Design a protein around this ligand. Structure first.
Ligand SMILES: Cn1c(=O)c2c(ncn2C)n(C)c1=O
Ligand SMILES: [Ca+2]
Ligand SMILES: [Zn+2]
Ligand SMILES: [Zn+2]
Lengths: 421, 107, 145, 48
């Protein structure tokens, strides 16, 4: 009645669906500032806002469900089209499941050890004649009838069964699909509880990418940052031995001794104490400890403070900051490097920005005409469009070159200006 | 596309070149329509071969949802890669682009 | 219109001194070193806002006894058991903290969730004080370079 | 300093050869040449 008719609408606005889906989550989490304890909902406004909250807590959820619908349209089988194209051409060139039988790894690939026999095998890729083609590539060698058989209302039992199961088993192994599925499970709890249900707001980390500059400026460098954490841990694991063996009188979290005077004379206790305090110190661990004013080991105590005062507070702060700002310069230089190499000499011939603009206003047009990279794609549409019975020799020729999957015809260093004088 | 190839293979004329400026207006109407690429068609040298651009398909290409994936792909290929299959990567990139425009036609 | 108010009032009339931002251009190196990069700096403000909008859920659901701006309880003991109140409190205090939010809060000395409290302090101690400070500084010095 | 030094070393390895050391572009004037020009014409372990 409306089924596949409206189906185009969902991917047709799926990005805008996603935008309004994340747009709701602000006003979801916005109202929880108007809370009061027990859990009380304050409305210092037109008091029907709480019933509209009761509305929107499931309205956002069915919006997210519609987002998964439009995604299930959109960024679905093209990925498995790629996967299927890959495994088809790799069994074609290689016969991996026939001759090679790959290892315990590539669970993605070993998942396709169960799609080999499947009936409508390129169900959205190209053609199934390639199966018979590679039978003729290999079945006379090893097993002709063996490997071919190894390949192969009223909708009552007329379905792809195990091919569909394989398809789903690939489908689960997606980042963004699982991201949005997790987002759906996040939006589940409006019917359950807003304990964590208003905490959808992680989705800004994949909604706008403007912020992802910063997150990437962290995340490539974090592999050393965990080691910074480790060295912090071990240097304080060192420091907690010292006064524990030598200044337990200088331990005092006591309320001036007349109370049950508190000193961490256990290694773990003073360790966690330095972790809680001496990390968050700022002014030094000598701030939150017994000062000496005449101790035998007073200068030892002082020098212990000084070594802390430097080696924690100065050093590791500066370490993390300098890591971050060299990460800044790294990422900026990488970005503009990419920009320059695009804006130098061409991609295709790739000879000289100066060289095809030796004649003025040439090189950009030399790009836009002699290389014009989308036009080669257009040309492939042109070739895959028409029939080889009507190809010219160039057309049939490069068609066959592509059929060979060879790609020699592209201009290395040999453009038209380069061709002549 | 014939006479432009005559212009391209033979510039530096007069009688052709006055015929090249004779009456050329649909010529200028014809420039979403013709593709001019540059290959080596086993001539052991360049070949500037031309062809038609189906402008309906080209309009189907004209949306984004791909152009940022294009520029992404640009960053990918200038970023790293085996430097010979980068054209092959472009082939696969085009094939998926075909798949995208094919699936976005029916909208 | 700035100079109008000498006949009116020197409430804001002596505040003409913004004009140094267009008088000498020697200073405009610094202001440009800010102003091209501020388009991300407003996003730094936004991420600050939302991470503390996260943090104000936590103890509000779990450590309201560890809330105490009380003057030792015998007074009308003050604990922000409203989400907006403790949110603005972290905004006022935990932003301006330096030593951590565990400084200006109930320490634990035997709580069931004492280690949860401690790890909450630690995560604050890093993720605010270290991180966002370093973010703004590194933004500024890559802007320099 | 240290990052620039490291990537500098990386570039100078990945430029022109160690042995002849002429042009990364130059032995890849012919396509797919220079890496094979390394791997065959210079192939430094082979001298060992
Ligand atoms: C079936 N099929 C093909 O076989 C094909 C193709 N492009 C290249 N080939 C070879 N496309 C787009 C295609 O649909
Ligand atoms: Ca023919
Ligand atoms: Zn080129
Ligand atoms: Zn050499």
């Amino acid at each position: 009645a409306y089924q596949q008719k409206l189906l185009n609408y969902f991917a047709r606005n799926f990005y805008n669906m996603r935008m309004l889906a994340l747009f709701v989550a602000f006003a979801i989490n916005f109202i929880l500032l108007f809370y009061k304890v027990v859990h009380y909902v304050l409305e210092e406004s037109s008091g029907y806002m709480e019933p509209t909250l009761r509305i929107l807590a499931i309205l956002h959820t069915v919006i997210s469900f519609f987002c998964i619908i439009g995604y299930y349209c959109l960024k679905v089988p093209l990925v498995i089209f790629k996967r299927e194209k890959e495994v088809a051409r790799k069994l074609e060139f290689d016969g991996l499941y026939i001759t090679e039988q790959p290892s315990e790894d590539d669970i993605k690939g070993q998942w396709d050890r169960l799609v080999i026999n499947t009936q409508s095998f390129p169900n959205n890729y190209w053609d199934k004649f390639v199966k018979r083609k590679v039978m003729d590539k290999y079945g006379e060698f090893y097993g002709r009838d063996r490997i071919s058989e190894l390949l192969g209302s009223a909708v009552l039992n007329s379905i792809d069964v195990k091919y569909q199961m394989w398809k789903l088993g690939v489908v689960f192994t997606d980042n963004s699909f699982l991201y949005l599925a997790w987002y759906m499970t996040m939006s589940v709890l409006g019917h359950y509880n807003n304990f964590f249900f208003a905490a959808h707001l992680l989705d800004i980390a994949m909604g706008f990418k403007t912020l992802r500059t910063i997150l990437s400026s962290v995340t490539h460098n974090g592999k050393q940052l965990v080691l910074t954490v480790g060295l912090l841990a071990v240097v304080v694991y060192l420091y907690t031995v010292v006064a524990f063996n030598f200044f337990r009188k200088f331990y005092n979290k006591s309320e001036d001794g007349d109370t049950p005077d508190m000193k961490c004379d256990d290694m773990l206790t003073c360790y966690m104490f330095h972790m809680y305090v001496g990390v968050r110190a700022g002014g030094g661990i000598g701030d939150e400890i017994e000062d000496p004013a005449g101790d035998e080991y007073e200068i030892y105590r002082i020098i212990f403070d000084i070594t802390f005062f430097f080696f924690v507070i100065v050093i590791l702060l500066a370490i993390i900051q300098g890591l971050i700002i060299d990460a800044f310069g790294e990422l900026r230089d990488q970005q503009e490097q990419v920009k320059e190499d695009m804006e130098t000499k061409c991609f295709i011939c790739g000879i000289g920005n100066d060289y095809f603009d030796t004649v003025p206003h040439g090189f950009e047009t030399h790009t836009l005409q002699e290389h014009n990279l989308a036009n080669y794609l257009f040309f492939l549409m042109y070739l895959i469009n028409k029939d080889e019975t009507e190809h010219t020799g160039q057309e049939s020729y490069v068609w066959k070159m592509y059929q060979e999957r060879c790609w020699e015809f592209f201009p290395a260093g040999d453009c038209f200006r380069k061709q002549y004088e | 596309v014939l006479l432009t190839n005559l212009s391209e293979h033979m510039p530096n004329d007069t009688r052709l070149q006055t015929f090249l400026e004779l009456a050329e207006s649909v010529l200028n109407y014809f420039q979403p329509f013709l593709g001019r690429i540059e290959i080596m068609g086993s001539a052991k040298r360049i070949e500037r071969v031309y062809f038609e651009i189906s402008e309906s398909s080209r309009t189907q290409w004209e949306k984004p949802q791909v152009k940022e994936s294009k520029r992404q792909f640009i960053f990918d290929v200038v970023n790293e890669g085996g430097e010979k299959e980068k054209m092959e990567l472009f082939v696969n990139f085009c094939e998926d682009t075909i798949f995208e425009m094919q699936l976005a036609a029916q909208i």
